[PDB]
Amino acid sequence: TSYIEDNSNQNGAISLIFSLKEEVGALAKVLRLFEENDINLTHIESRPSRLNKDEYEFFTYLDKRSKPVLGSIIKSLRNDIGATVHELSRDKEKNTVPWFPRTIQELDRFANQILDADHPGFKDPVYRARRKQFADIAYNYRHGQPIPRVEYTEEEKQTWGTVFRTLKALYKTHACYEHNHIFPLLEKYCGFREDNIPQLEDVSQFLQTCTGFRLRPVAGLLSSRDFLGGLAFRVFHCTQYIRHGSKPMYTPEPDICHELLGHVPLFSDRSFAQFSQEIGLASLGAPDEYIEKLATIYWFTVEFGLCKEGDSIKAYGAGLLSSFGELQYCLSDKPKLLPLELEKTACQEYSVTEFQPLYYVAESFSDAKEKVRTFAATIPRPFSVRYDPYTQRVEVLDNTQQLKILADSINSEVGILCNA
Amino acid sequence: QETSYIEDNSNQNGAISLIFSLKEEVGALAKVLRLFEENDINLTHIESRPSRLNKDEYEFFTYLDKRSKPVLGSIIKSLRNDIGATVHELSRDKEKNTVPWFPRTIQELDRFANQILDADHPGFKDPVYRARRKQFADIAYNYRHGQPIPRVEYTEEEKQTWGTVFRTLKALYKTHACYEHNHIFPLLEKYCGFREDNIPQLEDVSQFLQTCTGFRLRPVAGLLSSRDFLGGLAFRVFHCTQYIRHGSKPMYTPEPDICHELLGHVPLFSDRSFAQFSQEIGLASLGAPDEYIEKLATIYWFTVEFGLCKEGDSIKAYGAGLLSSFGELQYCLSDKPKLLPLELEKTACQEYSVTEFQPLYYVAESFSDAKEKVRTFAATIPRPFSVRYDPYTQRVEVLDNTQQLKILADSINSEVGILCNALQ
Amino acid sequence: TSYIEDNSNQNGAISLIFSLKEEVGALAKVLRLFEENDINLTHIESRPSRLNKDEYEFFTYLDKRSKPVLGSIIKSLRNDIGATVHELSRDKEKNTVPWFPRTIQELDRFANQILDADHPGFKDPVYRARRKQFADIAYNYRHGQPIPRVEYTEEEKQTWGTVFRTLKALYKTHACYEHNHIFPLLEKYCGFREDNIPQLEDVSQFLQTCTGFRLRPVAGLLSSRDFLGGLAFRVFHCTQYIRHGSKPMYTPEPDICHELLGHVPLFSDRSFAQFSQEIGLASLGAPDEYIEKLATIYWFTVEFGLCKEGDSIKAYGAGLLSSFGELQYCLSDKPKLLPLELEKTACQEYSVTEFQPLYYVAESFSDAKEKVRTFAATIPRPFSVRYDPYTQRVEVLDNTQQLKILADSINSEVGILCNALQK
Amino acid sequence: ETSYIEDNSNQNGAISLIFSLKEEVGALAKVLRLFEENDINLTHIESRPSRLNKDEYEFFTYLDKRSKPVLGSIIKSLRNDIGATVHELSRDKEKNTVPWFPRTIQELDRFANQILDADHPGFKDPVYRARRKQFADIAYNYRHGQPIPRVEYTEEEKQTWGTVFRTLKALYKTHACYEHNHIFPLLEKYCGFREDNIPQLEDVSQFLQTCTGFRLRPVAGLLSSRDFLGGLAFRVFHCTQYIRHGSKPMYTPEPDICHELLGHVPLFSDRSFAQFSQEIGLASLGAPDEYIEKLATIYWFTVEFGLCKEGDSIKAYGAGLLSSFGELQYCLSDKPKLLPLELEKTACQEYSVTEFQPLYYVAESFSDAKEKVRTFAATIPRPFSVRYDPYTQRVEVLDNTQQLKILADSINSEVGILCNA
């Protein structure tokens, strides 16, 4: 029930993924195809191919205002020029790949897609106006800007201290080794104290120093497709508000207690950063049927996952390390335990309110990453994906010549490994 | 005999970094921070981070200098005797038993980017041109990492100097420049404004290089030392100038000006195969002795600056000093000068001059072939550790002998996995 | 429990695994070190190291005849010469690694170690005298010889036809894809017919063409250590006799119906050949506590194992594909199914007489191979092993040698992949 | 006058069809029927499972020129109706066909009798001439798998061997490579490499099989370059069994037992060198005649007359140097020119077989030289790549992208072991 389907705006998003071999007038005739169709020369970004030395890569920033001229441009690119063109569409019409950000800067177009009666603090006028304050800050956040520092009230630090003290007194014996290895660093350099709520900017700079992970403040719950897409760029969309103080041990939406105490410590581990990033890469362009399956894998791993540690079993999921009740429950004899196998984990039924009657126990973060990679090969998409941390852009792999470049790259790295 | 190698000098404060790991134990992390805390050292000068290989170890980044020399000797002894950790002492002054200092993070390039060592310069009796050099120098002196490069409006007289160098060199790129140069240059003309009547802004060029290979531009007032300039290449940071040469002599510049940087270095920096070659030279310089910094500067001279590369059965030019000089570009591709195959065993010890043309050029087989030779030459550089750049964190990983194989094994394992899912 | 502990003869078997750096007189003084103790110059085989260009690898074929002089020789190799020597011993005495064959020709030493009361056909003199014929053929069989072709009687082909007809009518819906992929080839080229019993030589030559697997005729049941050790060489020790015709659906011992219809078809698949070989490599030099655990893993996988195939589950174990009764049982609602996890599979209890109440479902033959290899890393032995199909010998690898031989293997496999992507 | 020998064809020739088939309902039945309905025996069409694709079958067709009429119809049906990728091997090397090459180690017997006696030393010796007919019959009747027949050498022949053996032995320490001087002591103790004794091929073949899996196949004389190189892909070294005439102990117009055992055998026991010679053989499988000669030229300046660096010195590893007292002392002098091994122009270098070599190529190492041959193999025009399977002793013909995915997963498993080590 944690899967949220993605919605579309009035403008939407359309991207044309195609390469072009350098020829006499080749780059000019492609820009002519867009210029002669009343498409601005700033939406058509051309860059050199990061694999083929003789090809250009095009980044088209379009929307639903190009529907009439799209059919003519795609036909010329496929028939006359004869290039492989991939049509991205946000509305996910047939014969089109669902839209996904190709660069880390493209995460801003759908960062405002956010999903009252029995919510805790609905009848609190001080708390209600403060939720509009944190939401407005997130709506105005753009990539590159520093996360705005918000002064927290004394009453909110009490809510954080209640969740902090109970969970910290249980981390030593119930949390995984990675959690208890990163957490002391967060207490000293990010101010992870009982009487202090850490700032997202101080945590974002810490995550960038450990694994390059970035925090982007969001007003609420993004769609499963948009949230996973951020993991491919090692960007963790998180909230900035805190839960209501009347019931400190319940939150229908991820609050700052869930993000900083559940996701942040494990995100500082590189082996875990690659696992969460691999899930995001599988979501890029994935169909709706497989976005939900990836959200289910995300539920039984990053959110409510167990990991082996010698002859014992510890918890690494964020929903367990941010919930005092289920943390004592996950490492007990009440629930059933099954080995992590994504062939049936993605089709496993679950609930978001009550405890999990069944948990999947992973062998290691590296083992879980390889399973997500193998599962990604079954996701119907006409290409594979690879992240380039130097440029913070996604490399779209389709040509066999690109694999020749990747094969020679591996061969060179192996040759360096032989010299020892 | 008048070379391009510039030895590095030290300031009054200098820079000192302690490289050491720590196995996680009961109170281990607390007693290490106390060792610096009890010596009135701020908890921001001692940055502790988890080890990216050993799950049970911490990695420490100590940002100190010469203002901590008295208490430093006591701290290092406790880390080696009491705590018992392997400590490598980086020092800017390069005292004995210490590894020469090198930046570990991309933000550490600001410490020595303003240390630069008016007579026969063209336009020495021009106060407007002199005062404008003071303007560009102040911009570089006040520039910090992360800040956007200030956009400077260039005068019409400066566009005349740029237009003369731009038009003459462009008429030779098709037949004399390498394929990589002629592949990037059309993109620079359309998206960076590489026109005859326009001088591109460094910020617009820096944003373009970040999209291609992640290369960044760092404004500098003049010529940095070979150690500091090469160290920036390890972070894919290209220290470059912002001023333009004087208009009296449009085909002469004693120092690299904006015409030399944007037309010689920038286009090739957008190529990934060339970006890795230049980065490997920078990685070899990190912590290298002075004898090998000059040897790397000589390799840098006969490759990145004045290097030729094979392209089928023909020979093209890829050096920056050739693609930014109308005279020497026509000279390099003739039968008059001597040509030798690029082999760093004797290329690094070749003598050259900066004023007159090069009597000898080295012809590389490819950027990939030259990259492997630089890494092979780096294995002979006496350093008690290896180095690797991490683009995710923009920091340098200090790898000993054991951590070398684990990094490559984990990298090959990831690269093979992506190749499997692509083969479907 | 299908685990059979290995016994030792009066002579036993002793092998010294040690390398030698090439020096002035080094090779001469080592051969002299054995020659000066009246040890034959043919039992001490010296070969070059397949990794270090400057080292020699020694294959010593000894036994209990050298026990008094062994302690003196080992000291010189460790103290004077200074080489790392590991003593293999069949009796599995302390400070010695349990013996295992290093070459494919060394499978002949313990091929006669075999484990009449309630057997079907005990009161049949024709069937009993025929068991003496198949046993004698196996006792005299040596490595390299062609498997002797035995003509089966009409009464035996009737027994074969009953087991063949029932299993063939059930293979399509119950057997895995690999089984139904090899079986049509076996019917056309090996004579897998209802009215014909295939010859072992014709089947052994077929397996060599598919996965390089070889058949070695044995008189009966070898020990678990000796049987698994043959898998490291892709050699399948099998029997040649047939079950008695009175009970066509019962056999207390593995008969020709179990070997040719249960083990042979899956052995022709490469993905399964690597899985069965990986289990054999883990047994080489393994302690007795882990030989039984490997036999237990072998029981719930190769013998009685299930594998997923989409959203369905099929059978690939040999005890299921050679038994019409249990094949309908394994893919029914009667038994309990559990995911294959060797953490408790090696300690899982079972029985050999009655059907299995619980089966382990593997994800794939490749997935099961990786689980066995991960389990093999925990087996306490002072070295690793790797099979060399070029020389048909086992390479003894330690921590430093593993990195070089694997990196050189990866370098070669990546290199050819670079050219194939270039068409 | 080069060492390249073009291959000839018999009246029957040899034709092999390389094609795979995905398993479907009636797929295997329609292929066997396609050959049965054209009077092609079901024993010439050997079907085996694909050693990579779990869902495909691999077909080994043993045909020749006596199936030409029905071949054109079958190949068209396999490509149009069934729709499978079919590669037609042909010995006569007609156009649109790949030159024939053995796919299995047993297929080396078909053209092992193709051998190309006037001014030869010992022409007026009836005992030596009749003895040449004796060794030829042993090779003509030899089939793969049989043990090499042991021939007792006469006292007069042991004298000829002793003259070549003693002279070469006094130079191996300072002129031969380290690998040669590392293997040679083992050959003296276990193969009988003595001055007064000529080793038997069976004893030598079993030694090579234990070291690198190399096998010796007795041949009556000189096979074609295509057939000889093709044997290297299976690590099979076609060699002779006769000895040179005793009148000229330091001359032999044809490779004799002195050249094979003293030049090729010791280095063949080195695994790094065994892969190098095998890599050249793999490049020859299906290569055009223009590239068989180029590979024979690379083989000439490397395996036959090649030099290798060894520290700051240069030693000899070629077989033509380690089996010739005159050219071995000459190659490591200042008279001939030395050049680094670079196959871009080495394969087009002109040479002679009679007189000494005026130019030698110096390799860096056996591992470095192997990669150069593999790089050269990528330019050889063939519609597939090759891989040898030592388990089945058969050559894997790779065309599809699914086969590469399976090979990539194989590489992934070995990398995982290296990470957890």
Ligand SMILES: [Fe+3]
């Ligand atoms: Fe969460």
Ligand SMILES: [Fe+3]
């Ligand atoms: Fe420059």
Ligand SMILES: [Fe+3]
């Ligand atoms: Fe069995």
Ligand SMILES: [Fe+3]
């Ligand atoms: Fe020869």
